[PDB]
Point group: C3
Chain length 271, copies 3
């Protein structure tokens, strides 16, 4: 026999996780650490994911690898709604990349490990399960549509990785009587989507509109301008049957402002 | 390869777990025990509830009837009649829980919807009917919060290990399933738990430390050594007290220390 | 089918773990024996040597050890160590003792499932499950809370001095200590705990080599300051061992005995006399 262990997943995923250091200038001279967090190297190009709140208002950003290599990092963009931020590091002499299986479907009960730097103790692995799946939909909803896990999450785990027993990335750790074993991560599929969009446009451009029964209507919104009223029953959006409020709103977000569709001219979501 | 997962147990047991709602006085969780619509939960969840509501992970909601409750075990049985089929919690009565067994707690902590947390059995506790304290419950480092109460604790096979009851970290308790079964049946039948009460406490034989005034024992002294209760050898204080509880009030039994005692109903 | 379980490890290791009770005679006015604090301990071998945390037994007038088999023993303090917070006890045993499983050849790995065995809040023996979050170091030289073993297995007051074992029951470490930090707890690596025990058994205390790689500073009156070494010196050899690591070198110095004299190359070959580490 041999000891039960998840070290496999640790060997594979860990190196691609990094310590992130927000550095600001203190007016009341040099750079002082404002905060810290974790991040995941996504691909060989040097793209990294992390939590927006970690890098917010940073004058300088630094990224350290478990192999000891340190890099100055460039903010590629961020997103409030998902609390995600993409960084990039140059000077590539090769990089560890987080294992990814796009074909992998997360299931409730799946063993997962959270990799991060809680309280700047150095890299820390903690074990738990997927308590709840959440959604990969682009449209914001709330803390309920994230992935939920009883794997232990502290300050410093933010932007860290959540991987299954195979090291495959399940999500990005966002945030955690005293609630015990309740922590959240952004589903990896969604994180991918956000990353690409930030890489591409320097920001996340969301389609905004303002059966499914209309409870209210946004003044001056795209809907109010097209002639839609309260109590209307929406059966089709851009030729797609509207059978779900969640699925419909996720679809609207993928649509680009300026576009015109049969149900209106899409606008960009308000900050 | 495939990811290490307990999702199997989740598929099996989860559906039989429900959100319970006591304006709302409080909320909690419950376990559907069988196809008749009987549900288990914690008494403290439903106490002084004007109405009780039960929601299923399949979206079906039911008005629920309090079948009875128990303070000592903090258990309560509900019932809903359901035309359609109902999910029931997997049960293996032959299964012996062991310390170290992987377990999952299924419940609705902080009303976040159904939540699964993973841990192990830290300690077994006892299935004895006689109350003792928080030590004779099942103990687990699986995460338990407000809203997990009345929820289910199951092993990797989905088999019900116990009902979740209640800065200390990774210390949580559940009523052993074997005991929960017994309590359920008794509440279903009598609308309450009728316990055989004698009115002694003490610590082969059992030495009487004290005697309850007006109790069944006082009516039939300290320092007595009890060697036989109703023809059963008294070799254990725990096993004896559990035995007394199963005996019904009004009954009369031989006690050898040969006296004749009349069992009463336990004081609230 | 059968339920996923670690009970195997529990069966093997648990019996060798014990409840420890610090007792003093000045605790009450009537000068009776009363518990000042309590903890857990691990029976190491058949001789009755037990490991526990120093902070558990500190200033104990009496020490008591209880076994999961009901046997109780008066215990003798063999010695302690502040730096690792370890203490060795001994019990006079007759009729054999449970001993904690040990595999010296076993290499702990991050992610390995572990169980913490102890007596949290004196609830009786309690098992909690987690993994090794970080390895730490087995080096003798003190560093800090970072070079211990780290684990998300649940640790409370009363787990101190308890055992942390893998799925095979093999002792991985001795549990030392644990916004509210969740799933952050520490144990002394077993390899190191062994080293400390033997040294305490033998010398009644841990005798450490102290000296006082680019030199950032120098200790006044220290062995180094007395041999002629200065700041900014580059140390390339310590007692004929290449100094390629600050960690590996300091651990090496600790193994050296006070009074000893060794060559240090910085070329200048000096002669230093090792001293005993300051409390």
């Amino acid at each position: 026999m041999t000891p039960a262990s998840y070290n496999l997943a640790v060997r594979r995923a860990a190196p691609a996780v990094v310590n992130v250091y927000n550095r600001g200038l203190n007016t009341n001279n040099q750079l002082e650490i404002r905060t810290l967090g974790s991040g995941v190297i996504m691909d060989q190009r040097g793209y990294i994911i992390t939590n927006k709140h970690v890098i917010n208002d940073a004058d300088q950003i630094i990224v350290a690898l478990q192999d000891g290599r340190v890099f100055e990092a460039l903010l590629v963009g961020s997103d409030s709604l998902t609390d995600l931020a993409v960084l990039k590091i140059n000077a590539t002499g090769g990089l560890p990349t987080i294992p990814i299986n796009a074909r992998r479907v997360p299931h409730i009960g799946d063993v997962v490990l959270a990799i991060g730097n809680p309280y700047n103790l150095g890299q820390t692995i903690t074990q738990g399960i997927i308590s709840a799946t959440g959604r990969i939909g682009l449209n914001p909803t709330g803390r309920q549509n994230f992935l939920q896990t009883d794997a232990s999450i502290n300050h410093g785990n933010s932007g860290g990785a959540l991987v299954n027993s195979l090291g495959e990335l399940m999500g990005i750790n966002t945030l955690s009587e005293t609630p015990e074993g309740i922590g959240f991560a952004i589903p990896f599929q969604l994180a991918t989507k956000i990353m690409d969009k930030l890489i591409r446009d320097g920001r996340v451009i969301r389609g905004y509109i303002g059966g499914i029964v209309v409870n209210e209507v946004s003044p001056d919104g795209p809907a109010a301008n097209a002639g839609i009223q309260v109590n209307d029953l929406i059966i089709s959006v851009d030729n797609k049957p509207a059978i779900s409020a969640l699925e419909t709103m996720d679809q609207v977000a993928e649509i680009r402002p300026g576009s015109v569709i049969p149900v209106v001219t899409i606008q960009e979501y308000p900050a």
